[PDB]
Design a protein around this ligand. Structure first.
Ligand code: ZN
Ligand code: ZN
Ligand code: ZN
Lengths: 93, 245, 78, 105, 97, 102, 83
């Protein structure tokens, strides 16, 4: 049956960054686990923020502040820049 | 004195001024070798964590992979993939960085080597190389040769079931005597996976001093022997009636 | 400012912690650890405040900040 | 372009992210910018980690990134290590480290 | 007369361990908090309750840290906590690198 | 005439060699089948008649080995702080106390 | 078939090897039994949680996902087996 994964997108990114480098099945699974873990943490933090502010929706602001609470300094900064850039590009297009 | 030439001169067996009766050996050759060793399966490369420069020699420079190198502290020499490359000071068995030696008569007991010049402590002198024997072959060759009425038995057990023979072919490190005051010692080094033995010093041997290490007492037959050094506690005879090996 | 955490106060804290003999360099090391701890907690609390669009840091924000850090606090409307 | 990821110029599936957010009971409603933002964050983290993982695999003369590489990468980068400070990587192993007092003199 | 060194400390341990009142005077702590907070954002206000919560958490954390430090120093056959003890404690905790 | 052996290593050297050896690889160290038997016993006492996916056992073993390696690291740290070089049980207890384990 | 004393299946050499991967050089004799106890405690906790999840699931077989959930519960998240 269908067992969804981030395998393909991880491959795309990898080749974007290391075109000439493979990934093992075990490594691929680990990467998938990392992706899911970060997703869950950010989503939970955002939901918590939504609840704390008596708000019934999650917007990119909640995600952004969640990242700011979760990731470290430089990592958080670059992640925030990327997220805002992607949001702006999506809005424009 | 040594005068190693390929033409065999007039010399019966004394190995003095004409050591050209036997054939020399450069590396210990194996007989029953097989791909059942930890050579390239697990120990592929024990690279050292050095960060040399190599851009400063003869001025404020240091010898790479010194006593602070891990490999040297481990009784292991760096491989060809050392970060210095050819400036590594560990590959001494490959480059054959021996020391000055000479074989002459020094006592009626037998031929011996005396230091020619200064030789600081912890310095490679020579290497032990010879024919490595098998299990069933050792017990047969010893008994066949024991009846050959000979005094020198160049037998050295590298491991529990590997004895090296330097009788038929022996390098310069075969004339060394024994005494109760060892100024040298042997060390079991691992180069390229294979185990190798060497000969290092322990003190500031002056110029013109003997170079012998402490043998390990052991007997095989009923007969016994004794030494002739007489340093301070020259036991000579074996340590009791021993039979182990 | 930071030094306002007086050495004897650090001694009192340690005593409540069960310490009997205290070293000189302790005091400053404790000051540093306290500064770091406060930095993290207040950082998170501000972040919470900012997302709330408030110029006044609330207790609740402190509470969520501590809870994030796995240092849950009781007695301020948990 | 049709794909929302193409609209945002992203490699990750924005649609899948949107579904996930909605099928996770994180809030009553989900905004349209959050899937994009979160997908961008995930992409950025994956790229950052993969860079070091590939570099490590290179250092070990290997064409494929294996778990050992992922470990090495994460544990050597201070920030990544902090993000995954309470995480275990199967077959990860550890960074080679020996305490000073254990070295011979 | 004189109390032998090391006795009044035990009395104080008994004394402080039986009470719960905060041990850092409020105003310097509050000024420290405001100084620290300022570096993240300007013109910020604090509910006194928030400051009290901050102080509660900080003092409780410090007491726990010192408990661990005393444990370490005892393990090191010592009776005087020393910086290295706190470093070891925090390291094992995972707080310091 | 006898056969003599070269020399003997000083203590602790092979300890270091092993240390680097196992710090270079990643393969699991506890043997598999005893571990599986121990896990089966432990589960049995929690509930009878349970079966296991092999992958589950493997994940359990990975987490166990990781936990133990970290524990030993902290133990070694404690041993060093106690001006010693041999880790001793009390070191483990101190590590587990400070960790907040019971 | 009954299972007994399987804790001693964790032989001394294995514990030594682990301690090597932990950076330990010299191992006291009593360390082995203490380590056995620690491992038994940790395994008991993790298996309790995993079995609990399996029970709720109404399954007679423990799945890797159960183990991963249990570990994440213990603040010891694991990568490499899903989740
Ligand atoms: Zn080196
Ligand atoms: Zn070298
Ligand atoms: Zn003698």
């Amino acid at each position: 049956t269908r067992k969804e994964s981030y395998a393909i997108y991880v491959y795309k990114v990898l080749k974007q960054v290391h075109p000439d480098t493979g990934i093992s099945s075990k490594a691929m699974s680990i990467m998938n686990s990392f992706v899911n873990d970060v997703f869950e943490r950010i989503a939970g933090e955002a939901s918590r923020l939504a609840h704390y502010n008596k708000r019934s929706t999650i917007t990119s602001r909640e995600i952004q502040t969640a990242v700011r609470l979760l990731l470290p300094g430089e990592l958080a900064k670059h992640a925030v820049s990327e997220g805002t850039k992607a949001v702006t590009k999506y809005t424009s297009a | 004195d040594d005068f190693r030439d390929p033409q065999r001169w007039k010399e019966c067996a004394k190995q003095g001024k004409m050591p050209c009766y036997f054939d020399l050996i450069e590396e210990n050759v194996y007989l029953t070798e097989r791909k059942k060793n930890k050579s390239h399966r697990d120990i592929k490369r024990m690279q050292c964590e050095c960060t040399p420069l190599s851009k400063d020699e003869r001025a404020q420079g240091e010898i790479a992979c010194g006593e602070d190198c891990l490999n040297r502290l481990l009784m292991i020499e760096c491989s060809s993939r050392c970060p210095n490359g050819d400036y590594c000071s560990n590959r001494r068995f490959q480059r054959k960085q021996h020391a000055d030696v000479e074989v002459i008569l020094t006592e009626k007991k037998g031929w011996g080597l005396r230091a020619a010049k200064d030789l600081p402590s912890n310095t490679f002198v020579l290497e032990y190389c010879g024919e490595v024997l098998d299990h069933k072959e050792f017990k047969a060759r010893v008994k066949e040769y024991a009846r050959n009425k000979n005094i020198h038995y160049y037998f050295m057990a590298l491991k529990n079931d590997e004895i090296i023979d330097a009788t038929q072919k022996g390098n310069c490190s075969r004339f060394m005597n024994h005494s109760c005051e060892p100024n040298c010692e042997t060390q079991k080094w691992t180069v390229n996976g294979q185990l190798r033995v060497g000969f290092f010093t322990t003190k500031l041997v002056p110029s013109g001093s003997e170079l012998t290490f402490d043998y390990q007492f052991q007997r095989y037959g009923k007969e016994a022997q004794k030494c002739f050094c007489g340093s301070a506690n020259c036991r000579g005879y074996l340590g009791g009636e021993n039979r182990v090996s | 400012n930071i030094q306002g955490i007086t050495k004897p106060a650090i001694r009192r804290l340690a005593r409540r912690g069960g310490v009997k003999r205290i070293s000189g360099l302790i005091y400053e090391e404790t000051r540093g650890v306290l500064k770091v701890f406060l930095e993290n907690v207040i950082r998170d609390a501000v972040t919470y405040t900012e997302h709330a669009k408030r110029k006044t840091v609330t207790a609740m924000d402190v509470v969520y900040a501590l809870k994030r850090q796995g240092r849950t606090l009781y007695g301020f409307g948990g | 372009a049709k794909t929302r990821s193409s609209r945002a110029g992203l490699q990750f599936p924005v649609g899948r992210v949107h579904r996930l957010l909605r099928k996770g009971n994180y809030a009553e409603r989900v905004g349209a910018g959050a899937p994009v933002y979160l997908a961008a964050v995930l992409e950025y983290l994956t790229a950052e980690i993969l860079e070091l993982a590939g570099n490590a695999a290179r250092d070990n003369k290997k064409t494929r990134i294996i778990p050992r590489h992922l470990q090495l990468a994460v544990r050597n980068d201070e920030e990544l290590n902090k993000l995954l400070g309470r995480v275990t990587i199967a077959q990860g192993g550890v960074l080679p480290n020996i305490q000073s007092v254990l070295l011979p003199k | 007369h004189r109390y032998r060194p090391g006795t009044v400390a035990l009395r104080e341990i008994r004394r402080y361990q039986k009470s719960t009142e905060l041990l850092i005077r409020k105003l310097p702590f509050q000024r420290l908090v405001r100084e620290i907070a300022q570096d993240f954002k300007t013109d910020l206000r604090f509910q006194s309750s928030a400051v009290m919560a901050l102080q509660e958490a900080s003092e409780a954390y410090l007491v726990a840290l010192f408990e661990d430090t005393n444990l370490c120093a005892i393990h090191a056959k010592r009776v005087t906590i020393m910086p290295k003890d706190i470093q070891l404690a925090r390291r094992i905790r995972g707080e310091r690198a």
